[PDB]
Amino acid sequence: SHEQFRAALQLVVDPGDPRSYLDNFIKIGEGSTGIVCIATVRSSGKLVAVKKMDLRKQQRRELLFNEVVIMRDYQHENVVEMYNSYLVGDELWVVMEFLEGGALTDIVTHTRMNEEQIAAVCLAVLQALSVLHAQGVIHRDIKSDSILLTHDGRVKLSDFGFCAQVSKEVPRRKSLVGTPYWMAPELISRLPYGPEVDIWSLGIMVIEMVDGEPPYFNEPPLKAMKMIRDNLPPRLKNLHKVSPSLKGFLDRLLVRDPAQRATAAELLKHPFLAKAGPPASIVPLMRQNR
């Protein structure tokens, strides 16, 4: 059945082997579904990222089809560009744009962002989500680890491996998917859900940007999920460290009832986003600069 799946993937990916044109693979990241290396394009000296995913090590192998088609068919200023995909032995390799600024996690765990910076991140993420959600694509794993940066502070959404599509014929999803601390309550409750789950997860990322970590982060994942499911929306550890504007914004994201939660389209009009700085305002937060 692994052989069965390898054959299926071969029909969908690009032919060949990118080892023929790439040099000096260096591992830079470990994900939930595989590893990520930087590589040098031999002809150009340009750098790319290569996500390598072993078909034998997935919970749901068929989710790998998301890695082949989403980045390629849903392109945007604030979404990581994919170049090509290949079957290399037992692994799916995706060659994609290298986001040399690394992940937002490295910033939120090591420094404090001001509200100009938080708004810039939120604006970039919401622009991506408004376009994806209009097309029925739900990301389902929004967290700081999924937000990548360029050297010049541009913010891009990555890691669509666990995404799903909704449409008139399939208006909601049911799968238990995401990262425990960031999961929407309706998703934890196993109710049919839609794009709204990404907005909740974004609110949890706003808490990451303010506090350094999501709520209940010291609890075991299962216990955190119970608490998210059963409790009032999680509170900031330091409410005095956020403006009434940022609190009002957050109050539109962390709404338990998905019907009352703001949509990405609606949030793009929120006065909090008026504070967003240019990508330059993000630059000094990155490791190479701080």
Binding site: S32, D145, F162, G178, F217
Partner: peptide, 6 residues
Amino acid sequence: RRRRSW
């Protein structure tokens, strides 16, 4: 304190 997806 785990960050792994499910």
